């Protein structure tokens, strides 16, 4: 099969008219939609519960989005049976006719783009260039993985020849396996860790984050209709330590695609290395973490584009991003004129419902609001609050942009991920310590660095230990393709999504000798 | 750096007269040190203990054929710090420079191999051609990786372009590691198991099996020759339970790389999952464990080439291989005349001191006689015994070639691993039985096929589920580069030595971008 080279999907950023109206129409379809029920899907077809989720909007939490229905146990084993049922011939479809299946589900996608943004405003409160960037990224991961695919096609292994012999060595897909998926990309992670499995032969039984229930059921609806066969994809909204844990758990779950709270990943990584009753292999699990990821600033640096970039990577979605910068790592030259215009760019930013394009949303949920505003009042007697620390007025859960100054490096707040806007700055003396500094939490996710001297982003290169680092630029944001996304340490297992590595991790090697 | 196109080391078949002269030359010298004690070696230096090792002749047990030195907790600490001190300078080197440090390692192998091979005659009881084919692919091993590591060199990543951008993704390796390893292959899969890491920059300590810790030592004086910097390979011969499992629970063990039992395997990938107290990684780990691998003959094959390959299959080495064919499964027409073929070739085997390049020397302990004894006393309750069955006269482990014949194939003789001359035959209707039985074990490492159907070979070649798979010839004697080595199921984890893919598992992946 031969199509166009990859190219990432542009993000929308509304500055025309076409596109803002084009945004308006979705948005008022959306809203006008809310209250839609979402059932399970499961053997190709959609399956009611007695039970439900609710989806609210976190800018207006007396507002349902919509419901779904709920998986239990019971679902969950009707899942595993399809799933399992579909592999059996899923498996030995040739992968151009797989990677096809997902050319079409992202031609799909892409012309319901427009919804599937409006359906992330009012689900988890992205404003509109956020939603944009979700919707374009999952779009990315699908039609980077069907091309990515082809390049484990039968036979796709270098071997030494023999005499006499014919030695063939190819890969072959591992079987049923579940997806568990975030809340703060519910259409791009969720549909890069099911596609990526499915390219190349895998089944999926996906569980999407209980905050995003009703998006993920849309990505469901293209899948259904791009035609992948009965039990290849399965959808079960449910409980995370309910269903999710029954599947980790499970003997005849072959793999685990995990993204989310390093709580959660630790206690699925364990499990994933338990032999459960009757199981017979050893279970794959790839967990991504998190982060507590810092950008440093040093004096040689262009101090006006480091404010910039620092006050995205920070406050972009509300700073709930695996990948924010978390912590701004000041050499003592660049301390003052570095935080004075951080202060400055930030104390602009509009906070409000994301439906009015705001620089911030609210935050997802009551808990997370919660979390957060408990972090705020443990940052108050860690650091200097210089900026915010407060929510807003109104039923949405809003915070303000917060900035905690001359913070402890081994502070809660400069330690652990708090997942919302509130930015630790740390005052160094030099780009060594800075190093020091940036390396020294559980995490390697995502870095930054602000210099214009060669010498510091070099070193920076060979020892700020993140796996995804940006030099000049915002730390968030990573492009399928451009970008391996994943990290070390306590940020996961290093399953580097958008990446030709990331399809490996499915697959399994069988050699065949014939002697003639 | 360009060397010559990787080849296999040729196995020594002693059919001239110079290679039997050498051969004799080198069980001499062999012999001679049989007084030998062999330390620890730790940090570039040799380290006794007040403790020691023993290891016996397994053809004459009352003979010592060395002692070691014997590893506790302290020592595995030590040995710890000198591995991540290593680490430190040793990933920083250029890939060629470990590249020819490996090359070097090899070439001084290969001018030791009668030694080595002598070594494996007398500590672990192989004849002649076994302990060729075992030192000749360790250096395999060691050429392979060299050459394999080079192309994950810096900036090894396929990655899409950004404008305005330089993104480039390139591979850094883990850390320091524990290699533990059997007896059974004290040489090849003790070196690859080590090489490999250490190629891409990882540091290692290796913990040799009690049975075969004389033959490690040799393979260490190798390592110190070659010039491997302090810490970067450590020896530390010690009890399994003890030193091991302490290595493998250690916080700051960032790998852990094992051949072995299914038994230990499970309870290394579970102690594996778990997060040590500090620790800050999740640990990988890759277990290689059992098999009960199956030959198939169907009414087609070329029944004296069958009877030829399985004899050599189930007995090469005495049957104590995880690729050992213990199960024979013959279709209604294959039955008689392949069962007459084996029984007759093997009921021709000479069993007796592995010196003399018998065609079976000893088991290689008491331990395993034990175990082997007992399951021929399962065996007679479960089939019927035809051929062997018993201990041979003297105190050498020798047991005689064994067959059970209308063996079912739940029979725990057609189930769990034996790892001894002890071959179960199953009787089935037709090839589509055949592979329903030889799929319907908890393993999937070895198999093979003997029939002229080409229908019947595809599709084994598409169904018959384990990783390493043979038409035609024998089901052992996995080639590095020619034949990926590593099974499916409880089998391990698919970790394919002698392979590109290997490598990748001693490595994680950067990404940095720079916006100019
Ligand atoms: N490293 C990455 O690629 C990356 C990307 C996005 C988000 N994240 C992480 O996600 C976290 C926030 O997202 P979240 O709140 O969805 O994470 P979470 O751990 O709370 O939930 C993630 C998913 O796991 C499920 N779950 C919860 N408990 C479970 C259990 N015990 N067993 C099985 N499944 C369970 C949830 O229902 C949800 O589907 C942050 O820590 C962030 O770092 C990481
Ligand atoms: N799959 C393969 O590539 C392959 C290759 C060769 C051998 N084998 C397998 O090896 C087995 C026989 O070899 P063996 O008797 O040396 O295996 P084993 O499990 O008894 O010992 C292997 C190594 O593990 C150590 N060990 C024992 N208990 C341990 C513990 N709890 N924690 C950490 N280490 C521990 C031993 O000291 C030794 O070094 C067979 O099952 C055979 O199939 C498999
Ligand atoms: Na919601
Ligand atoms: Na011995």
Wanted: glycine content about 10%; hydrophobic content about 40%.
């Amino acid at each position: 099969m031969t199509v166009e080279p990859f190219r990432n999907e542009p993000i929308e950023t509304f500055q025309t008219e076409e596109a803002r109206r084009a945004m308006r129409e979705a948005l008022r379809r959306v809203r006008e939609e809310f209250g839609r029920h979402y059932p399970l899907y499961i053997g190709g077809e959609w399956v009611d519960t007695k039970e439900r989720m609710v989806s609210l909007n976190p800018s207006a939490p007396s507002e349902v989005v919509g419901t779904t229905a709920k998986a239990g146990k019971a679902e969950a084993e009707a899942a595993l049976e399809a799933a399992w049922k579909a592999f059996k011939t899923w498996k030995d479809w040739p992968q151009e006719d797989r990677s096809r299946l997902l050319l079409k589900a992202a031609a799909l996608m892409r012309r319901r783009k427009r919804e599937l943004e409006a359906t992330l405003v009012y689900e988890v409160g992205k404003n509109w260039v956020e939603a944009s960037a979700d919707v374009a990224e999952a779009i990315d991961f699908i039609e980077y993985y069907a091309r990515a695919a082809l390049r484990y096609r039968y036979p796709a292994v270098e071997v030494v020849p023999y005499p006499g012999e014919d030695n063939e060595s190819f890969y072959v897909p591992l079987g049923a396996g579940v997806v568990i998926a975030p809340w703060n990309f519910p259409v791009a992670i969720f549909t890069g860790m099911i596609v990526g499995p499915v390219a190349v032969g895998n089944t999926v039984i996906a569980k999407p984050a209980e905050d995003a229930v009703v998006v993920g059921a849309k990505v469901f609806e293209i899948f259904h209709e791009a035609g992948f066969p009965p039990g290849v994809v399965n959808f079960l909204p449910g409980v995370g330590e309910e269903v999710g844990a029954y599947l980790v758990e499970h003997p005849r779950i072959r793999f685990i695609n995990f993204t989310g709270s390093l709580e959660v990943g630790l206690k699925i990584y364990e499990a994933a290395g338990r032999l459960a009753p009757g199981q017979t292999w050893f279970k794959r699990a790839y967990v991504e973490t998190g982060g507590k990821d810092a950008i440093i600033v040093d004096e040689t640096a262009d101090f006006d584009l480091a404010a910039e970039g620092v006050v995205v990577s920070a406050y972009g979605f509300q700073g709930q991003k695996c990948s924010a910068a978390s912590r701004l790592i000041l050499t003592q030259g660049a301390y003052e004129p570095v935080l004075e215009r951080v202060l400055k760019r930030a104390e602009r930013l509009s906070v409000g419902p994301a439906e009015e394009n705001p620089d911030l949303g609210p935050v997802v949920s009551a808990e997370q609001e919660r979390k957060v505003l408990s972090y705020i009042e443990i940052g108050k007697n860690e650091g200097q609050l210089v900026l915010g620390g407060k929510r807003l007025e109104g039923e949405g859960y809003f915070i303000a942009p917060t900035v905690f100054t001359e913070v402890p490096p081994k502070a809660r707040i400069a330690q652990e991920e708090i997942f919302g806007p509130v930015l630790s700055v740390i005052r160094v003396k030099d780009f060594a310590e800075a190093l020091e500094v940036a390396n020294d939490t559980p995490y390697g996710l995502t870095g930054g660095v602000y210099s214009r001297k060669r010498e510091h982003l070099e070193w920076a290169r060979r020892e700020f230990h993140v796996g995804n680092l940006y030099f000049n630029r915002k730390i968030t944001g990573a492009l399928v393709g451009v970008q391996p996304f994943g990290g070390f340490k306590l940020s996961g297992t290093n399953a580097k999504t958008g990446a030709l590595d990331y399809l490996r991790l499915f697959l399994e090697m069988k050699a065949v000798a014939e002697r003639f």
